[PDB]
Amino acid sequence: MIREERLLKVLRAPHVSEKASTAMEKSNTIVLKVAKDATKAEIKAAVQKLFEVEVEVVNTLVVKGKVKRHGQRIGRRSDWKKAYVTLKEGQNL
Amino acid sequence: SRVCQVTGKRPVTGNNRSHALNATKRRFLPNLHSHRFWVESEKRFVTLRVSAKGMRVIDKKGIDTVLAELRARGEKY
Amino acid sequence: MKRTFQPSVLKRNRSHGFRARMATKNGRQVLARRRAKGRARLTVSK
């Protein structure tokens, strides 16, 4: 039936609830911060198993981490991938 | 590779000496030749990159005993 | 003037990259020399 559940730890954290995620929430979709290697099928199965809601489509985006520190100690933020999973009718999240 | 394949003569180096005793460096490379040797035991011709002194070793020892020495030395024909 | 340095990542990673160095014996020597020096950026790749 469903893919093995130890690989359903891909969903890391939802979001910070900023206005892009919330405006896109009140229009159609929820925004999720997910893994680094999670396939769109894995994000979809993880939503449909760990949450109770079916999902129409996933849009996957990885975003570069920032440098964010000054010249005394140059650092870099870790890369992360964000998913827009589409929940069209009966959205409960 | 210029190896005698039965006795292992190799190009060795030693300088040219002139009348004014000058030392320009040259090579003493062997008299290698490719010869097909008839073996009675396996009933087949076999080629070998052999110096002329190696062919003297061939005609003295015999083809099969020096081929057995090559096979014990673990070197292809 | 057309300046000397005209950048291209293909040409850079095929002339001074890790695989452009580890194919040749002297490239393996320069990589081991930079390892013995202790450098963080071994080659020009990143």
Add this chain to the structure above:
Amino acid sequence: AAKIRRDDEVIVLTGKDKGKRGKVKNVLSSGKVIVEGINLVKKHQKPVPALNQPGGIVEKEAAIQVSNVAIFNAATGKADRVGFRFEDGKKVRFFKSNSETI
């Protein structure tokens, strides 16, 4: 092993006060214990949110070194040194030249 533990009545030998005696609060990892009423200092606390909101001239205990403070003998009103003498998993601390365990 540690010669002065979490909650023992100790007396100082060197450093500002000498005769004042107190109970050790905690032992720092760096070997600078806190014993109350001994190393007082009134600092200047900045106005910061949440913890210590107004600030003030709040007195807090500063760190006294372990070697400057000794374990006070309960029976006789003196400082005393202590040592360890036992073989199994529990080492008793006993008063030197009183030979009484703590």
Add this chain to the structure above:
Amino acid sequence: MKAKELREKSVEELNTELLNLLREQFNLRMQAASGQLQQSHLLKQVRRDVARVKTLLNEKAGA
């Protein structure tokens, strides 16, 4: 009864690992992203428990 892991020296602990990860570490990460307090020590505790039951599943093939 000899070691201090007698709760994990029992049989069929893979469903214990699954209960310890599935929705447990997940919902702990959910409210850690949302922001709470006892969660701060709770996710290290449950991560160590998941590591412990995973090596107990690795040291024997009988559970």
Add this chain to the structure above:
RNA sequence: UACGGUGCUGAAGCAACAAAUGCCCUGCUUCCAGGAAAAGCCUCUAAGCAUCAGGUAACAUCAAAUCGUACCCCAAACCG
């Protein structure tokens, strides 16, 4: 009026002419200096398989993963 931007409504929405270096054009004509390769694609059999496999048309369903996507756009983000 958050003074930029939002909800509703929104008339006519046509002809003639001039139109390229773009399209027909991987065309036509002409010339010598005679103008890549392989794959996708279309057929044919070899060994094999004969209610098999496979192909063809229709319909239904499912899948199309992963990476790049901001910004500079002949320049204050490239090379100097």
Add this chain to the structure above:
RNA sequence: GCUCGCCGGAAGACCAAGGGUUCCUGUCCAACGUUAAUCGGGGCAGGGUGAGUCGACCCCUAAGGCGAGGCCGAAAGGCGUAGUCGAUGGGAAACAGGUUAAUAUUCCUGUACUUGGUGUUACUGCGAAGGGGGGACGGAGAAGGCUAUGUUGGCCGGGCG
């Protein structure tokens, strides 16, 4: 905000290389800005790049590179067959309108297109590092027919200065 000037085969716009957060928002003006700066590509913090149809990846090859054996070398190594790489070329498919402060052939609305897997109905000789066809290719020149586009006229909404 109203005027003035400059470019407008760019000093406008979009790709590629290259760079890498410089993009957008709130805040600050020590250091950078050849001056002050409330401002900035500056500090700090938060936000932002959504793809079956656009590229890469993928399937093929060119110049050329690597090369099992192999041939040649004092060793190191040089060359090269099978093969395997290499786009700057050849291979399947999406447009118009709207949206954000920041993304759009990617989100939304409408209308579609392409390649495979599976299942069913009916027909049936299917079958390849193999053969053939195709892909498949130059320069120059002249029409002819158009379209992108522009001008005028009608029409419409305003003007009566």
Add this chain to the structure above:
RNA sequence: AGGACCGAACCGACUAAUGUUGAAAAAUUAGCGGAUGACUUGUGGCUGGGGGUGAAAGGCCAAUCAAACCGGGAGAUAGCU
């Protein structure tokens, strides 16, 4: 048709002037030569130092060339400062 003619892009660099502690480690402003060809350009490749390449100048080979750059012989030697 043409290594045809005038002339933009584009390629180049003949004269002058300014710059010459410049806007710039060879440029700007007027003029100038070619501009369907022996043209020009993007992308990738090949040729490595007593070597390459050269419509030939000792030209060019990373602002460096009668012989590249880097490291090692090497603290060369220096009857000379």
Add this chain to the structure above:
RNA sequence: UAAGGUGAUAUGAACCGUUAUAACCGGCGAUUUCCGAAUGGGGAAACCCAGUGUGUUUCGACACACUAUCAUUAACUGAAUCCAUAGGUUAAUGAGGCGAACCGGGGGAACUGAAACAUCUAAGUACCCCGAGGAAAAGAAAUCAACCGAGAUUCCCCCAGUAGCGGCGAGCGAACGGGGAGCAGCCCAGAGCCUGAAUCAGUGUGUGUGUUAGUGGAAGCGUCUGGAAAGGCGCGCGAUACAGGGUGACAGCCCCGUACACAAAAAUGCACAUGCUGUGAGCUCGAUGAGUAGGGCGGGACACGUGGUAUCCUGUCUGAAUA
């Protein structure tokens, strides 16, 4: 070992234990993404894409294991060609790559010195490559000696800047013998005889000595100055501990220590008294190693530059006798 911890800048929040399972330290075990010899193919290191085999399933697809090249061996297949052989496939065992120096070998300069320079020197140095080990090489006399004799190799001190070589210039430079450090010889070309009789490895019960954690460990108080005594002044005490580091100024008696006693679950280094296995001791004598020694022609090494030039190595051509 333990009353304190969750490594640092680094505070904070939230927690864990208080002699019995917090942390910390030690042995063994577990996981160990991707790249990298990188090893499934490829590539622009940290990426793209495969094949086979097991398992799960309204079925979208996932999980794990294996799959590089070469050498040796074994099996099966197998052409021109009849047999074979070349070739192909499978399985086992091993290698690959890195590393500062030491060792052996294949190559091998020039600056410089000669007050130039070519013979010579620098120098078989710098450098390149190959290979191996904890050391490597060498090593058991076809060696020296001098009519007396020593008995393998290597390393140190003399012989000795000597004999000698040398545009007899620059310069290079031994040996014999003596004093030491260490000191062990053996085997095949061979048959028969008695035949794991003594050594060499592997593996093991057990002991000892180490290592990888550690445990005890002496004895100081007044007063003065001072911000603070470890300094000054008095009286004591410990020392197989007055090495050392901190402690608010200079501490034997404040704390870690140090001298000195003790300690090992668990794994590994030597001595093995030792059980088993593999190789083999000692009597007779056949031979005691042929394209070799030697030679001619070019060279190289030996301190030795071909000179009167012995000895060793060989690129070319020849070539014996065999106790």
